[PDB]
Amino acid sequence: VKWTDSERFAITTLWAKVDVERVGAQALVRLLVVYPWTQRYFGAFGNISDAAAIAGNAKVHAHGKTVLSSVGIAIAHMDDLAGAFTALSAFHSETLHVDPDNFEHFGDCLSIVLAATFGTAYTPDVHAAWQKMIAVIISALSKEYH
């Protein structure tokens, strides 16, 4: 992937204001509510069968934070992500069997959350850069499927 300086800066500057706890919890909450079949993949978290239960679940919170820190790691490897994410990809494919359509559900949730969190600061250009970052993450996580 080739990045413009403006893309680079849009991403790292927004990221410097991201609460990985609140954003990560909220993104994962949305994934589990909006795409409720993804709940199957997270059997270890206990009761996540309805919105109030998902949203108050401390394991959903901790895991959202983990996902967002990995997003942080993708940003740090944004010039070499296919490579940096090889194990993580392989892990989602061979151990968990996640259909990769779910990676874009998650991306969409994350973009939605950033919009809710940032409001008008999530300008069309900053949104565009973040969608490119998410697309790169999705592509990296989908790669060790073949």
Place this chain on the structure above:
Amino acid sequence: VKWTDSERFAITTLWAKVDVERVGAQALVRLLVVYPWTQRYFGAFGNISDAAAIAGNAKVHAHGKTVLSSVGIAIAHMDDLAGAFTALSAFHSETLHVDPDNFEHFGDCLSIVLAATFGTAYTPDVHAAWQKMIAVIISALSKEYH
């Protein structure tokens, strides 16, 4: 991508019996009939608005053969396809604006045609190898989108 010898051989042996004319025409015919909105992208071919017209169209035939020869080229570059297809990817994205969902419609058409052409010789294992080859082609053609 990593290939087994059995995959390698399944692909090249099937390919040695492919009539790139008949298979390429039939795959493209199916794309244009089954996903008829793809017809927009092929304005140069004249009237392709119905099945009998698509199937008898000499430009549909010639272009199917071209697509299948490019498939031939992917097979020859099956260890380095992302790279070999960079221009072709870029061409489908920046000049033509093909949504990449259509790459898998085309793949599906191609697999269907190989099954029709080969019958019981298109065994589950040979089908699996060909689906992997098609997935690699799709991924290569979708890459210069980001």
Place this chain on the structure above:
Amino acid sequence: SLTSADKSHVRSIWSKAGGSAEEIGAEALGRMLESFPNTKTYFDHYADLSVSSAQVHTHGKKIIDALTTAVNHIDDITGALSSLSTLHAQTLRVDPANFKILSHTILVVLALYFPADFTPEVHLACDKFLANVSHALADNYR
């Protein structure tokens, strides 16, 4: 299908936003065009694809008004949108893979402008509702 709870949620968020049809629609369209640049060829006749574009404003209002109509005929989205389906399929020749893209940027804009109203359950409802709208617009394609 949308449940009663879904339709309440859709009518709620749409009641809160429909007054900003133009602003909302220009943001959603603008964002589709910039974040998903394979869509720009469809609007290549416009001189300006930016959110301030007057053509983007006029068309954005049309999109949001058409959705408002669907929200007001939420038990029959098919009949509300079948004419628009024909139009997008036969006249505009829009590849129907693009419908989910505008659906997503609509959700983004709703989140952005009404973050407290756009709770996870409202998002679910609005996602089902725009999938239904998209499935309806795709219906005449083949």
Place this chain on the structure above:
Amino acid sequence: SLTSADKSHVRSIWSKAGGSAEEIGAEALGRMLESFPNTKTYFDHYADLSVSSAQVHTHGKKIIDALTTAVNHIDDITGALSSLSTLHAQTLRVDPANFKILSHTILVVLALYFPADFTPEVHLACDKFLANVSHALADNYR
């Protein structure tokens, strides 16, 4: 929606194939499992996932018989399959992205076994019909 010409085409190809329910269904299931190996976790309880597997044969016949029922109630696929939708959603917990995968291997198998019957227009009809079946099975998921 399926047109009259679509339904004729679906009934035609299904009339020609329904007598081989078990063979056809075992090929389609077997092929899904081998060509799309992310599906295998759903059938991890079977000792053999191959086309000769007796469990793959028994289940393949069930799949094709359920589709036959849909073909015989082709004007209401929703009502025919709503029970199976509940089952796949709540009991089996099948991620609904997988429905298009079995739809595709069904089409492959129909091509393979009835290449002269599976003309482009029949393929179109059968593709619309399995999309409708898939949309129906997905309906209870959310």
